[PDB]
Structures are given as C-alpha cells and as structure tokens.
Design a protein around this ligand. Structure first.
Ligand code: HEM
Ligand SMILES: O=C(N[C@@H](Cn1ccnc1)c1ccc(Cl)cc1Cl)c1ccc(-c2nnc(-c3ccccc3)o2)cc1
Length: 450
C-alpha cells in the first residue's frame, strides 16, 4: 500500500486502548491483528499512536534501523532521574553508544573468570540460611530475586565496595529509585516536568549511592599507594574507560551506568530463574527435569567456567524457553524520528513503534502451541525469538544473565528437589514493568537431597 498501517478504532475517548491492553495484552494484540487482517497495525495509548510490528517476518524493520531513525531516547525519558541527565539514552547518540559499549565490555565472557564460584558461594550461603530443614515452604520468586542480587553483587563488585554497600542495602537503594519511576510518563510526558515527591526520593537514593561510590574510589586510590590490593571489578572497569574524544567517564556517568546495569539485570534474571524452576518441578515436565539431572549428574561440587559455559546446553534451552513463553519485557519501543517502511506500509515520523516479544513469541507459525513450555523447541520462523532483543539495542547482559540462571539451576537442583503447591504453573502477572510469574502463586516446597 505504502500508506499508514491500518488504525485500530478507538472506542474509549482520551484513554485509547490502554485499558483493554492491561486487561489482556496478548489477547488484545492478537484480536487487533485478526480484525485488521494485518500484522502491522496502530493502536492508541492515551492519544499517542503506537504502531506494532506484530509479524515475526518483519522484525528486522524494527531492530535494524539506526538510532537517528528509530530512537529509544524519548521512551526512556522517565528513567533519567535514575540513570542521570546525559547518561545512556539521554546522552547524544554517539556518546550513548560509547557508554553502552563500556558497560558491555564489563559483561563479556572474558570477565567471567571467577564468577561461577562467586555465584555458587552466594547461592549456597542463601540455601544454608533459608532452606535449612529437611523440607519447608518458601516463595520461590522472592528467594530467586534475593539470590540474584547477592550473586550479581558478588560477581560485579570487589569486596571493598561490598563492605560499604552490601547486597541488602544496594537492593534497598535500588528499590527506592525504582519505586519513584512513572512509566506512564512515556505517554504523559507532562509528568516529567512536575514537582513530585517521587523526584525528591529518587534524587535522594541516587545521590547517596553516588556518595558511596566516590568514597569507595577515594579509598581505592589509597590501597593503590599501599599495594595492598589491585581490585578489578565493574567499577574499576568503567573508571578506566576513555571516550573517543580522549576524556574519561565522569563520576555521574559511572554511577549511572552502574545503576542501569543493576536495574536491568535484577528482575529479568530473577524471573527467568523462577520460571525455569517452576517449569522443571511441574509433573508434566519430569522428562525435562530428568534431562537436567543427567546434564549435571557428573559435575563437581565446585563448578568451573567450562561446566556452566560449555556443559549446560539443556539448562540454557530451559532458560531461553522460559523467556520465550513468558518474556519479561512485553513491549520494546522506539520513537519514529523519520518515516520508515515496515511491511507494505509507511510508519510516520512521530509514532511510537513497538515490537512485542509477548506477541511474537505466541505466533503459532513461529511457536506451535505457544503456551506449552518445551525446551527442545526450535524457532520455525527466522528471528522470531526476541526475548533479548536484537540489532542496535540488543541485550548486552544476556550471557551474564544466563550465566547466573544456569549456575543457580545447577546449584539448586544438586542439593534440592521442589514441589509446586498448585496444580498449575503460575499465571504471568502483567501488572508490573518487568513481567514475572504471579508472586502469590510461587509458593513451593523445597526437599533437601540428603
Ligand atoms: C535474562 C535476562 C535479560 C533479559 C530477558 C533481557 C532482555 C533484554 C531486551 C529484550 C533488551 C532490548 C531492549 C530494547 O529493545 O529496547 C535488552 C537490552 C539491554 N539489556 Fe538486557 N536482558 C536481560 C539481562 C540483562 C542484564 C543481566 C543486563 C546488565 C547486567 C542487561 C542489560 C541490558 C542493557 C544495558 C540493554 C540496552 C542495550 C542497548 O540499548 O544497546 N540485560 N535486554
Ligand atoms: O526494565 C526496563 N528496561 C530495562 C530493560 N532490560 C532489563 C534487562 N535488560 C534490559 C533497561 C533497558 C536498558 C537500560 Cl540502559 C536499562 C534498563 Cl533498566 C523497562 C523500561 C520501560 C518499560 C516500559 N515502558 N512502557 C512500557 C509498557 C507500556 C505499555 C504496555 C506495556 C509496557 O514498558 C519496561 C521495562
């Protein structure tokens, strides 16, 4: 056609479709697609046009154009109080890319040397403290989420940082920053300009984190004179980065990339672990639990890099399929800065364009019987899996996240079995920013494998 995507009619004035979307994100999107006879279509969120790239065959039209054409900056305006002014997506595109590359470099597999033991240490410490009886009842999502913050901190931060800012206090500062976020501001940008009590809190937590970082940096320069230590961590990595123009990252920027890394990795990784365990313990999946048991059957007590990286293909499939079925990020978005072709249409300058892992992961051609968790499945449409994104803004933490998931799975199932206290795997809870299993349905019985 070369014209605009078909518009889905608005029946609710002012609000547009946001209500029907919350009620049933997948159901609503699939209904639009059916009724409009197009995988590319435009919905309306509080007056803003959102064009969905809902055909897995057209994913490349979303993930591949340059920032200058499809930009994430405006979509992330509401996180500026957390990352900081001029940090990540708020910085000019070449500088954004530089800061993101500096972070990515700290999460490459060449940094993973002592991560496996760090993760195992923290996981065993947690299990010993909280899974300390022959059997007992626990909330698996809460416990996975506590292990992820502990493990991430143990891997990424040297012992000195941890003595001043341990995983508990770090989680508290981050939860105070996160608590302040108003993602509605994507569609109601007037919010970003208002005095809100949120802003004061957020600024508070961030400035306290940045104070702690500066104090750590000053202390480290002193251990440098003494040659007591030479700590190599996430912080030292970003500290040594130098931009193309010859200058270093400011403290502001360093702090902001640390916050982005920690925000990003916490919920997604915790959720992926939780789903993966929930599926593995369910009676319908005994064959898959068997397979994981076989994979790890001959592993040593103290795992190494090679065991997790190279000898857990099935665990990795489990993690990936969990993300496939229940993607923690439902909608990836960009601001359209200039007219782009998508499918047989032109998406106009000023639209938000979106591509939905939720929608695409449930395309029946790409993923037959998509509600069936099957780690042995393989995509049947090229590039249909987008749980880690793709192209210009593809996930830079994927290997680190999967490292943690797989290690937790090997560590946990070595020492325990688990029983779901429900007939079914929990329902996904779509009411949060990062989507996981319904927290109240995640009660499980652990059983110590004596
Ligand atoms: C299993 C866990 C994870 C999942 C499912 C996940 C998913 C994703 C997705 C879907 C995107 C693309 C976002 C978009 O298109 O707008 C993304 C990008 C990103 N992820 Fe992850 N992520 C995970 C773990 C992590 C971790 C552990 C980190 C950091 C430690 C991280 C850092 C990032 C960053 C910084 C981006 C932005 C990259 C850019 O704009 O170039 N992620 N991730
Ligand atoms: O968590 C959000 N963004 C993270 C995503 N992430 C996590 C791990 N890897 C990526 C993020 C990305 C890049 C960077 Cl530098 C930092 C972080 Cl913390 C996030 C942000 C916004 C939304 C969001 N905004 N609007 C919606 C929305 C709107 C309508 C319907 C459904 C969702 O979601 C969702 C997740």
């Amino acid at each position: 056609k070369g014209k605009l995507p078909p518009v889905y009619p608005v029946t609710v004035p002012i609000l547009g479709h946001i209500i029907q979307f919350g009620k049933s994100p997948l159901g609503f999107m699939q209904e639009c697609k059916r009724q409009l006879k197009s995988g590319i279509f435009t919905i309306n969120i509080v007056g803003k046009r959102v064009t969905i790239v809902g055909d897995p065959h057209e994913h490349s039209r979303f993930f591949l154009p340059r920032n200058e054409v499809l930009s994430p900056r405006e979509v992330y305006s509401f996180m500026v109080p957390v990352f900081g002014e001029g940090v990540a997506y708020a910085a000019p595109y070449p500088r954004m890319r530089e800061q993101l590359n500096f972070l990515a470099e700290e999460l490459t597999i060449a940094k993973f040397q002592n991560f496996v033991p760090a993760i195992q240490h923290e996981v065993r410490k947690f299990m010993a403290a909280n899974w300390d009886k022959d059997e007992g009842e626990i909330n698996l999502l809460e416990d996975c989420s506590t292990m992820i913050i502990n493990t991430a901190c143990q891997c990424l931060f040297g012992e000195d940082l941890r003595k001043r800012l341990d995983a508990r206090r770090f989680a508290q500062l981050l939860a105070k920053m996160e608590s302040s976020l108003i993602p509605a501001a994507v569609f109601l940008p007037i919010l970003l300009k208002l005095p809100l009590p949120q802003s004061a809190r957020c600024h508070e937590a961030r400035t306290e984190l940045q104070k702690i970082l500066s104090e750590i940096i000053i202390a480290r320069k002193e251990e440098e004179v003494n040659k007591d230590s030479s700590t190599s961590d996430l912080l030292s990595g970003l500290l040594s980065a130098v931009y193309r123009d010859g200058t270093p990252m400011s403290l502001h920027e360093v702090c902001g990339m640390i916050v982005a890394a920690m925000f990003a990795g916490q919920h997604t990784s915790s959720i992926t672990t939780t789903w993966s365990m929930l599926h593995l313990m369910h009676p319908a999946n005994v064959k898959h639990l068997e397979a994981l048991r076989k994979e790890i059957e001959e592993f040593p007590a103290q795992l190494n890099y090679n065991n997790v990286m190279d000898e857990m293909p099935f665990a990795e499939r489990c993690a990936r399929e969990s993300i496939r079925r229940d993607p923690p990020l439902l909608m990836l978005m960009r601001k359209v800065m200039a007219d782009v072709k998508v499918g047989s249409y032109v998406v106009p300058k000023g639209d938000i364009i979106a591509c939905s892992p939720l929608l695409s992961h449930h395309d029946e051609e790409a993923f037959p019987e998509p509600r069936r968790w099957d780690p042995e499945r393989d995509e049947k449409v090229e590039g249909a899996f987008i749980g880690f994104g793709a192209g210009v803004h593809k996930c830079i933490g994927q290997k680190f996240g999967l490292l943690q998931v797989k290690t937790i799975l090997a560590t946990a199932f070595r020492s325990y079995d688990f029983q779901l206290l429900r007939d079914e795997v929990p329902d996904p809870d779509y009411h949060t920013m990062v989507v996981g299993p319904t927290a109240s349905q995640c009660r499980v019985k652990y059983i110590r494998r004596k």
